[PDB]
Amino acid sequence: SQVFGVARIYASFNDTFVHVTDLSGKETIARVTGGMKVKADRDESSPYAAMLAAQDVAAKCKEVGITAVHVKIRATGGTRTKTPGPGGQAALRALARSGLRIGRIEDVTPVPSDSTRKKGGRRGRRL
Template sequence: MVKHAAEEASSSNLQSAAQAPSPESVAAPEPPRQTGTRWGICHIFSSYNNTIMHVTDMTGSETIGIVSGGQMVKSDRLESSPTTAMAGARKLAELCLDKGVTGVHIRIRAPGGHNGPMTPGPGAQAVVRTLSRRGLKIGLIEDVTPIPHGGCRKKGGKRGRRV
């Protein structure tokens, strides 16, 4: 009986030594993955002449990426087109995903103010669609066009613009 117990103990020690991994085969532990969404703010300025897309962190102080329609095409007349805005948004989405931003809140701005149009240009809607198709989560969509509150006198003289 004593012999059998000693043999079992030595055989169990051999098995545990065979199962223990060698130090060379042990891989370094993977860094913990963030399960939450890292958010940024996408500022879109869309006029009838150009579309500018700018992604910042949530405080607005650090730029993650900036792209304009003029960087995508050579001719000036194509800077504000939806096709150019889509190409810029694709590039911007890649920049965001490379830097770890997986969701954006969108702030759309038209020229506005006293003289500019209050509606965004043709590229704004194309940018929002492209960002969502490229895998970024879309949070809030907000219109931040400047609105005049009285202010300066409009041009046109005493009798206004005569047509």
């Protein structure tokens, strides 16, 4: 049968993390980010650097033995936006298209039961 890992795509703004672990989550198999793949440090959040991160993560899942993966897409959460950034779906498309098999897609963004006053003041972040 297939051997499953967990993809654990933290797609924030300003960066994307593709982090395959084992089924327990305690062993890391190729955490690769977008700033490892682009040198402009605004394109870390871009769909392009997510694609190059996810394809090399998929290229290290093979030679280790991971053939299929559960994905855990994940925005910043907490007091932040709760909206996954521009590279989550690009990382998902690349990791699905680069030889791995996918099952059990879920979103795991950390949501409070309202807690911990948001950063920015009362008038907000005014530009």
